[PDB]
């Protein structure tokens, strides 16, 4: 009852905000460093970071956001 409600509150009241933050919190340079392509100047570093910026932009898309929130919400409903 309680945790499920709290999960649903997160999605309904905070879900877009949280997703926005998840998306905006991604750091192309950090992600590209973990991929071994940037350092904490090579051409693949720059291309990787461009690719991550574009990944983040895909994640902002309405369809993607709505799919993610709906996925989470369906899981909230599975909390006993």
């Amino acid at each position: 009852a309680i945790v499920s409600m709290e999960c649903k509150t997160i999605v309904s009241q905070y879900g877009e905000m949280i997703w926005d933050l998840l998306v905006s919190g991604v750091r192309p340079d950090q992600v590209c460093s973990q991929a071994g392509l940037c350092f904490v100047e090579a051409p693949l570093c720059t291309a990787c970071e461009m690719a991550v910026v574009w990944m983040q932009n895909q994640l902002k898309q309405e369809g993607t956001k709505e799919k993610v929130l709906e996925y989470v919400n369906q899981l909230c409903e599975k909390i006993p």
Side-chain angles (χ1 to χ4, degrees):
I2 209 263
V3 169
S4 185
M5 279 177 221
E6 285 290 270
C7 190
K8 285 180 206 159
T9 296
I10 287 295
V11 180
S12 66
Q13 294 200 42
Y14 297 92
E16 290 200 344
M17 180 165 167
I18 296 166
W19 175 245
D20 285 0
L21 292 161
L22 182 165
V23 178
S24 286
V26 24
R27 289 159 304 214
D29 64 345
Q30 215 58 61
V31 172
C32 289
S33 286
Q34 297 173 103
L37 302 176
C38 292
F39 161 58
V40 172
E41 260 177 14
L44 293 168
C45 173
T46 310
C48 182
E49 279 170 340
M50 275 167 15
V52 176
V53 168
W54 285 333
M55 296 173 181
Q56 286 171 280
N57 202 66
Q58 207 288 132
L59 289 189
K60 290 176 219 151
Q61 298 302 310
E62 263 317 296
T64 297
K65 167 205 316 215
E66 299 169 14
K67 181 155 153 68
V68 171
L69 301 182
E70 182 48 44
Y71 181 82
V72 174
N73 199 50
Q74 293 283 36
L75 285 157
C76 297
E77 297 172 356
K78 289 183 171 73
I79 300 169

XYZ file of all heavy atoms in Angstrom:
619
model
N 0.840 -1.237 0.000
C 0.000 0.000 0.000
C 0.866 1.275 0.000
O 0.911 1.995 -1.003
C -1.016 -0.015 1.200
N 1.574 1.523 1.105
C 2.391 2.737 1.293
C 3.519 2.935 0.244
O 3.593 4.000 -0.408
C 2.902 2.842 2.797
C 3.101 4.309 3.220
C 4.124 1.865 3.109
C 4.497 4.799 3.101
N 4.382 1.930 0.070
C 5.516 2.083 -0.842
C 4.993 2.250 -2.280
O 5.477 3.061 -3.028
C 6.599 0.951 -0.687
C 7.612 0.996 -1.830
C 7.347 1.121 0.608
N 3.988 1.478 -2.658
C 3.426 1.606 -3.989
C 2.925 3.044 -4.248
O 3.264 3.681 -5.253
C 2.295 0.595 -4.143
O 1.850 0.675 -5.474
N 2.145 3.570 -3.304
C 1.672 4.952 -3.359
C 2.798 5.945 -3.529
O 2.696 6.884 -4.344
C 0.912 5.329 -2.071
C -0.507 4.890 -1.997
S -1.228 5.339 -0.375
C -2.217 3.883 0.050
N 3.855 5.764 -2.737
C 5.039 6.615 -2.812
C 5.737 6.515 -4.176
O 6.208 7.513 -4.709
C 6.038 6.259 -1.683
C 5.595 6.753 -0.334
C 5.667 8.256 -0.227
O 6.719 8.782 0.173
O 4.664 8.905 -0.550
N 5.805 5.302 -4.718
C 6.289 5.094 -6.068
C 5.441 5.867 -7.072
O 5.973 6.576 -7.902
C 6.213 3.593 -6.428
S 7.068 3.235 -7.994
N 4.123 5.716 -6.977
C 3.225 6.452 -7.872
C 3.299 7.946 -7.738
O 3.199 8.651 -8.745
C 1.791 5.963 -7.780
C 1.616 4.619 -8.489
C 0.166 4.164 -8.374
C 0.037 2.658 -8.462
N -1.256 2.163 -7.856
N 3.524 8.416 -6.522
C 3.704 9.840 -6.284
C 4.955 10.320 -6.973
O 4.944 11.351 -7.651
C 3.752 10.143 -4.801
O 2.463 9.801 -4.269
C 4.004 11.652 -4.543
N 6.034 9.540 -6.839
C 7.228 9.872 -7.553
C 6.909 10.042 -9.047
O 7.277 11.045 -9.656
C 8.337 8.778 -7.385
C 8.957 8.818 -5.981
C 9.374 8.870 -8.521
C 9.744 10.114 -5.616
N 6.274 9.048 -9.662
C 6.069 9.147 -11.101
C 5.152 10.351 -11.445
O 5.493 11.176 -12.311
C 5.514 7.808 -11.702
C 5.315 7.931 -13.225
C 6.455 6.637 -11.392
N 4.009 10.445 -10.793
C 3.007 11.461 -11.160
C 3.498 12.857 -10.812
O 3.388 13.744 -11.633
C 1.665 11.194 -10.500
O 1.792 11.336 -9.109
N 4.061 13.027 -9.615
C 4.475 14.354 -9.140
C 5.888 14.737 -9.497
O 6.173 15.916 -9.637
C 4.319 14.468 -7.636
C 2.883 14.406 -7.293
C 2.648 14.965 -5.960
O 3.231 16.001 -5.600
N 1.793 14.294 -5.181
N 6.762 13.758 -9.632
C 8.175 14.057 -9.799
C 8.794 13.397 -11.017
O 9.961 13.587 -11.273
C 8.986 13.556 -8.588
C 8.605 14.229 -7.312
C 7.643 13.679 -6.492
C 9.212 15.420 -6.931
C 7.279 14.272 -5.283
C 8.866 16.030 -5.751
C 7.917 15.456 -4.922
O 7.590 16.041 -3.738
N 8.008 12.643 -11.778
C 8.623 11.709 -12.761
C 9.320 12.458 -13.874
O 10.445 12.134 -14.225
N 8.658 13.433 -14.469
C 9.282 14.195 -15.541
C 10.498 14.935 -15.016
O 11.524 15.016 -15.695
C 8.317 15.206 -16.176
C 7.256 14.556 -16.967
C 6.624 15.504 -17.940
O 6.814 16.733 -17.765
O 5.942 15.011 -18.873
N 10.382 15.510 -13.824
C 11.503 16.223 -13.247
C 12.702 15.285 -13.028
O 13.865 15.613 -13.343
C 11.069 16.816 -11.946
C 12.112 17.594 -11.206
S 11.377 18.589 -9.935
C 12.901 19.003 -9.080
N 12.430 14.105 -12.490
C 13.511 13.177 -12.235
C 14.151 12.709 -13.536
O 15.380 12.663 -13.638
C 13.021 11.982 -11.387
C 12.559 12.494 -9.987
C 13.989 10.769 -11.468
C 11.734 11.460 -9.152
N 13.323 12.354 -14.508
C 13.822 11.929 -15.795
C 14.646 13.041 -16.406
O 15.694 12.778 -16.979
C 12.658 11.660 -16.746
C 13.101 11.324 -18.107
C 12.896 12.047 -19.265
C 13.803 10.144 -18.475
N 13.467 11.365 -20.350
C 14.037 10.204 -19.875
C 14.308 9.050 -17.741
C 14.686 9.172 -20.568
C 14.970 8.066 -18.425
C 15.167 8.134 -19.802
N 14.173 14.283 -16.312
C 14.953 15.403 -16.852
C 16.368 15.487 -16.261
O 17.393 15.726 -16.950
C 14.187 16.688 -16.652
C 12.999 16.815 -17.649
O 12.760 15.902 -18.493
O 12.293 17.818 -17.560
N 16.412 15.258 -14.968
C 17.635 15.291 -14.221
C 18.522 14.108 -14.549
O 19.713 14.270 -14.555
C 17.374 15.367 -12.701
C 16.763 16.708 -12.264
C 16.089 16.571 -10.889
C 17.779 17.877 -12.267
N 17.937 12.942 -14.787
C 18.686 11.749 -15.127
C 19.368 12.083 -16.446
O 20.562 11.904 -16.576
C 17.763 10.520 -15.294
C 18.350 9.149 -15.605
C 17.246 8.106 -15.333
C 18.690 9.115 -17.113
N 18.580 12.566 -17.391
C 19.046 12.908 -18.701
C 20.150 14.000 -18.626
O 21.245 13.830 -19.204
C 17.888 13.281 -19.632
C 18.424 13.706 -21.029
C 16.966 12.083 -19.836
N 19.889 15.080 -17.898
C 20.823 16.208 -17.828
C 22.063 15.901 -17.001
O 23.127 16.566 -17.172
C 20.125 17.463 -17.288
O 19.288 17.990 -18.308
N 21.948 14.886 -16.132
C 23.079 14.468 -15.307
C 24.096 13.651 -16.112
O 25.240 13.528 -15.717
N 23.726 13.121 -17.255
C 24.750 12.400 -18.043
C 25.875 13.322 -18.531
O 25.613 14.417 -19.001
C 24.184 11.481 -19.093
C 22.869 11.840 -19.538
C 25.143 11.322 -20.301
N 27.128 12.908 -18.363
C 28.244 13.771 -18.765
C 28.977 13.074 -19.866
O 29.581 12.063 -19.615
C 29.194 14.038 -17.595
C 28.577 14.973 -16.526
C 29.299 14.815 -15.186
N 29.319 13.425 -14.691
C 29.259 13.076 -13.397
N 29.147 14.005 -12.436
N 29.299 11.789 -13.058
N 28.871 13.595 -21.103
C 29.485 12.953 -22.268
C 30.925 12.655 -21.977
O 31.415 11.601 -22.335
C 29.380 14.065 -23.336
C 28.039 14.578 -23.026
C 28.103 14.789 -21.512
N 31.628 13.585 -21.354
C 33.040 13.326 -21.117
C 33.359 12.162 -20.198
O 34.322 11.414 -20.414
C 33.815 14.586 -20.744
C 33.381 15.206 -19.440
O 32.299 14.900 -18.884
O 34.141 16.066 -18.975
N 32.517 11.997 -19.195
C 32.657 10.931 -18.213
C 32.298 9.608 -18.860
O 32.974 8.610 -18.642
C 31.664 11.187 -17.072
C 32.169 10.795 -15.812
C 33.483 11.506 -15.468
O 33.557 12.752 -15.372
N 34.526 10.708 -15.275
N 31.210 9.610 -19.622
C 30.746 8.400 -20.285
C 31.826 7.990 -21.292
O 32.247 6.847 -21.308
C 29.447 8.647 -21.069
C 29.118 7.414 -21.891
C 28.288 8.844 -20.130
N 32.317 8.961 -22.062
C 33.392 8.697 -23.046
C 34.717 8.274 -22.437
O 35.427 7.446 -23.001
C 33.527 9.925 -23.901
S 32.024 9.973 -24.945
N 35.041 8.805 -21.269
C 36.179 8.309 -20.511
C 36.010 6.841 -20.063
O 36.928 6.034 -20.209
C 36.450 9.199 -19.304
O 37.027 10.402 -19.740
N 34.840 6.499 -19.549
C 34.586 5.099 -19.212
C 34.619 4.192 -20.440
O 34.953 3.036 -20.304
C 33.273 4.970 -18.522
C 33.271 5.720 -17.225
C 31.894 5.706 -16.649
O 31.627 4.963 -15.725
N 30.981 6.468 -17.245
N 34.277 4.730 -21.609
C 34.435 3.979 -22.873
C 35.868 3.908 -23.378
O 36.110 3.285 -24.393
C 33.540 4.571 -23.950
N 36.792 4.607 -22.703
C 38.194 4.542 -23.041
C 38.498 5.502 -24.185
O 39.509 5.362 -24.846
N 37.607 6.443 -24.485
C 37.829 7.236 -25.672
C 38.227 8.671 -25.346
O 38.760 9.348 -26.222
C 36.608 7.274 -26.602
C 36.165 5.877 -27.069
C 34.914 6.023 -27.875
C 37.282 5.278 -27.894
N 38.020 9.092 -24.096
C 38.398 10.432 -23.647
C 39.175 10.319 -22.397
O 39.044 9.353 -21.676
C 37.150 11.276 -23.299
S 36.190 11.664 -24.773
N 39.943 11.352 -22.098
C 40.613 11.416 -20.831
C 39.938 12.409 -19.876
O 39.611 13.515 -20.263
C 42.095 11.721 -20.984
C 42.708 12.238 -19.725
C 42.663 11.474 -18.539
C 43.303 13.523 -19.686
C 43.251 11.979 -17.299
C 43.878 14.025 -18.475
C 43.848 13.245 -17.288
N 39.693 11.929 -18.648
C 39.233 12.656 -17.457
C 39.549 14.164 -17.497
O 40.382 14.673 -16.712
C 39.902 11.987 -16.156
C 39.657 12.782 -14.861
C 39.499 10.483 -16.013
N 40.836 15.023 -26.410
C 41.540 15.624 -27.544
C 41.648 14.702 -28.771
O 41.695 15.194 -29.908
C 42.901 16.227 -27.143
C 42.771 17.766 -26.965
C 44.048 18.460 -26.507
O 45.140 17.842 -26.552
O 43.960 19.647 -26.104
N 41.640 13.383 -28.566
C 41.577 12.475 -29.714
C 40.242 12.648 -30.523
O 39.183 12.982 -29.961
C 41.756 11.047 -29.273
N 40.295 12.393 -31.845
C 39.072 12.514 -32.623
C 37.928 11.602 -32.176
O 36.766 12.002 -32.273
C 39.524 12.182 -34.045
C 40.974 12.615 -34.052
C 41.489 12.194 -32.706
N 38.216 10.390 -31.696
C 37.106 9.571 -31.237
C 36.557 10.106 -29.924
O 35.474 9.772 -29.541
C 37.477 8.101 -31.058
C 37.809 7.387 -32.376
C 38.438 6.069 -31.938
C 36.476 7.185 -33.045
N 37.358 10.856 -29.185
C 36.856 11.434 -27.965
C 35.746 12.453 -28.345
O 34.627 12.445 -27.826
C 37.976 12.185 -27.240
S 37.253 13.067 -25.836
N 36.085 13.350 -29.240
C 35.145 14.359 -29.663
C 33.890 13.716 -30.290
O 32.783 14.153 -30.039
C 35.837 15.280 -30.669
O 37.088 15.689 -30.111
C 34.994 16.503 -30.957
N 34.072 12.691 -31.118
C 32.916 12.019 -31.741
C 32.097 11.298 -30.699
O 30.855 11.321 -30.750
C 33.403 11.030 -32.886
N 32.755 10.672 -29.741
C 32.038 10.008 -28.703
C 31.188 11.050 -27.955
O 30.050 10.775 -27.594
C 33.041 9.408 -27.687
S 32.258 8.496 -26.339
N 31.780 12.179 -27.582
C 31.031 13.129 -26.786
C 29.815 13.668 -27.604
O 28.743 13.837 -27.053
C 31.908 14.303 -26.434
C 32.806 13.896 -25.219
C 33.900 14.868 -24.901
O 34.283 15.679 -25.765
O 34.421 14.771 -23.772
N 30.016 13.900 -28.885
C 28.910 14.291 -29.791
C 27.857 13.228 -29.800
O 26.674 13.579 -29.690
C 29.402 14.508 -31.215
C 29.940 15.854 -31.520
S 30.846 15.982 -33.066
C 30.373 14.469 -33.873
N 28.257 11.942 -29.888
C 27.301 10.869 -29.845
C 26.517 10.875 -28.516
O 25.324 10.667 -28.566
C 27.917 9.502 -30.105
N 27.178 11.072 -27.366
C 26.497 11.092 -26.061
C 25.539 12.281 -25.972
O 24.420 12.128 -25.518
C 27.459 11.083 -24.848
C 26.693 11.214 -23.489
C 28.268 9.723 -24.872
N 25.979 13.460 -26.384
C 25.033 14.598 -26.458
C 23.793 14.238 -27.318
O 22.657 14.549 -26.976
C 25.765 15.815 -27.085
C 24.755 16.917 -27.471
C 26.841 16.274 -26.141
N 23.996 13.584 -28.434
C 22.829 13.191 -29.211
C 21.999 12.111 -28.538
O 20.780 12.101 -28.722
C 23.254 12.762 -30.582
C 23.608 13.942 -31.423
C 23.108 15.233 -31.294
C 24.461 13.953 -32.556
N 23.599 16.017 -32.302
C 24.444 15.267 -33.081
C 25.269 12.981 -33.179
C 25.173 15.626 -34.206
C 25.951 13.323 -34.330
C 25.935 14.651 -34.810
N 22.652 11.175 -27.799
C 21.898 10.202 -27.008
C 21.031 10.911 -25.994
O 19.880 10.533 -25.822
C 22.800 9.182 -26.305
C 23.536 8.331 -27.338
S 24.697 7.351 -26.377
C 25.504 6.454 -27.681
N 21.591 11.900 -25.317
C 20.824 12.646 -24.328
C 19.669 13.351 -24.968
O 18.629 13.475 -24.337
C 21.665 13.707 -23.654
C 22.684 13.095 -22.630
C 23.652 14.169 -22.132
O 24.608 14.489 -22.830
N 23.357 14.786 -20.963
N 19.883 13.857 -26.178
C 18.784 14.561 -26.849
C 17.664 13.590 -27.223
O 16.483 13.984 -27.095
C 19.235 15.274 -28.100
C 18.298 16.386 -28.468
O 18.193 17.347 -27.752
N 17.624 16.266 -29.620
N 18.006 12.363 -27.642
C 16.989 11.335 -27.887
C 16.241 11.094 -26.585
O 15.017 10.950 -26.563
C 17.562 10.027 -28.433
C 16.588 9.206 -29.293
C 15.539 8.588 -28.518
O 14.335 8.665 -28.871
N 15.937 7.958 -27.425
N 16.938 11.120 -25.471
C 16.262 10.744 -24.231
C 15.256 11.816 -23.789
O 14.357 11.513 -23.003
C 17.293 10.503 -23.131
C 18.105 9.241 -23.318
C 18.907 9.037 -22.043
C 17.135 8.081 -23.569
N 15.407 13.030 -24.313
C 14.500 14.154 -24.004
C 13.211 14.023 -24.784
O 12.240 14.750 -24.514
C 15.139 15.487 -24.451
C 16.340 15.949 -23.655
C 16.901 17.249 -24.298
C 18.476 17.321 -24.321
N 19.087 18.128 -25.474
N 13.213 13.170 -25.807
C 12.101 13.138 -26.741
C 10.833 12.727 -25.991
O 10.914 11.946 -25.065
C 12.378 12.238 -27.966
C 13.592 12.658 -28.890
C 13.514 14.064 -29.472
O 12.487 14.445 -30.050
N 14.616 14.831 -29.378
N 9.671 13.286 -26.359
C 8.397 12.950 -25.655
C 8.102 11.459 -25.537
O 7.835 10.954 -24.447
C 7.163 13.617 -26.322
C 6.689 14.905 -25.695
C 6.668 14.896 -24.159
O 5.914 14.116 -23.525
O 7.420 15.719 -23.590
N 8.112 10.777 -26.682
C 7.918 9.342 -26.729
C 8.798 8.593 -25.741
O 8.336 7.705 -25.051
N 10.082 8.943 -25.681
C 11.008 8.217 -24.840
C 10.701 8.439 -23.344
O 10.603 7.483 -22.580
C 12.436 8.602 -25.182
O 12.690 8.215 -26.534
C 13.448 7.942 -24.201
N 10.551 9.705 -22.962
C 10.138 10.102 -21.626
C 8.871 9.379 -21.232
O 8.817 8.793 -20.157
C 9.913 11.622 -21.569
C 9.170 12.092 -20.304
C 8.426 13.443 -20.534
C 9.309 14.452 -21.291
N 9.085 15.846 -20.850
N 7.858 9.395 -22.101
C 6.548 8.845 -21.729
C 6.657 7.312 -21.561
O 6.020 6.723 -20.681
C 5.471 9.208 -22.753
C 5.208 10.747 -22.934
C 4.301 11.072 -24.164
O 3.662 10.147 -24.713
O 4.237 12.248 -24.612
N 7.476 6.683 -22.403
C 7.687 5.231 -22.345
C 8.363 4.908 -21.006
O 8.026 3.936 -20.330
C 8.615 4.831 -23.506
C 8.948 3.351 -23.649
C 9.307 3.096 -25.124
C 10.232 1.917 -25.291
N 9.527 0.643 -24.949
N 9.319 5.735 -20.615
C 10.066 5.429 -19.427
C 9.169 5.616 -18.217
O 9.152 4.760 -17.345
C 11.275 6.326 -19.268
C 11.915 6.115 -17.877
C 12.306 5.970 -20.323
N 8.450 6.732 -18.150
C 7.523 6.964 -17.020
C 6.425 5.907 -16.904
O 6.101 5.476 -15.800
C 6.976 8.374 -17.020
C 8.062 9.459 -16.942
C 7.427 10.845 -16.895
C 8.945 9.243 -15.735
N 5.872 5.480 -18.035
C 4.871 4.444 -18.053
C 5.488 3.119 -17.565
O 4.903 2.438 -16.761
C 4.234 4.313 -19.450
C 3.130 3.287 -19.558
C 2.124 3.427 -18.447
O 1.724 4.577 -18.146
O 1.761 2.388 -17.855
N 6.669 2.776 -18.057
C 7.378 1.577 -17.539
C 7.511 1.583 -16.010
O 7.228 0.577 -15.329
C 8.791 1.546 -18.151
C 9.617 0.374 -17.726
C 9.467 -0.871 -18.356
C 10.537 0.500 -16.702
C 10.238 -1.944 -17.999
C 11.330 -0.557 -16.329
C 11.168 -1.785 -16.960
O 11.922 -2.851 -16.578
N 7.986 2.695 -15.469
C 8.177 2.839 -14.018
C 6.826 2.750 -13.311
O 6.693 2.069 -12.283
C 8.815 4.169 -13.681
C 8.863 4.380 -12.147
C 10.211 4.227 -14.346
N 5.838 3.446 -13.866
C 4.548 3.428 -13.252
C 3.974 1.994 -13.182
O 3.380 1.616 -12.177
C 3.597 4.324 -14.059
C 2.403 4.728 -13.256
O 2.552 5.196 -12.117
N 1.202 4.542 -13.817
N 4.108 1.224 -14.278
C 3.606 -0.140 -14.279
C 4.316 -0.950 -13.176
O 3.718 -1.809 -12.578
C 3.817 -0.811 -15.644
C 2.966 -0.195 -16.780
C 1.484 -0.594 -16.786
O 0.843 -0.769 -15.734
N 0.915 -0.726 -18.014
N 5.598 -0.686 -12.938
C 6.340 -1.322 -11.834
C 5.880 -0.860 -10.441
O 5.767 -1.692 -9.535
C 7.856 -1.146 -12.020
C 8.387 -2.071 -13.100
C 9.713 -1.486 -13.636
C 8.607 -3.505 -12.554
N 5.575 0.437 -10.272
C 4.991 0.909 -9.019
C 3.785 0.055 -8.681
O 3.584 -0.292 -7.510
C 4.455 2.340 -9.127
S 5.719 3.498 -9.458
N 2.967 -0.233 -9.696
C 1.712 -0.985 -9.517
C 1.959 -2.436 -9.150
O 1.051 -3.123 -8.719
C 0.837 -0.907 -10.774
C 0.399 0.531 -11.062
C -0.305 0.713 -12.398
O -0.412 -0.281 -13.176
O -0.769 1.856 -12.666
N 3.196 -2.892 -9.308
C 3.582 -4.234 -8.927
C 4.166 -4.345 -7.512
O 4.540 -5.439 -7.073
C 4.504 -4.815 -9.999
C 3.724 -5.109 -11.280
C 4.598 -5.752 -12.320
C 3.736 -6.222 -13.479
N 3.278 -5.012 -14.265
N 4.299 -3.198 -6.836
C 4.799 -3.159 -5.479
C 3.663 -3.591 -4.547
O 2.622 -2.962 -4.529
C 5.296 -1.731 -5.070
C 6.427 -1.282 -6.001
C 5.817 -1.737 -3.577
C 6.776 0.190 -5.829
N 3.852 -4.680 -3.805
C 2.790 -5.104 -2.866
C 2.854 -4.343 -1.529
O 2.075 -4.532 -0.589
C 3.067 -6.595 -2.664
C 4.453 -6.848 -3.188
C 4.971 -5.642 -3.890
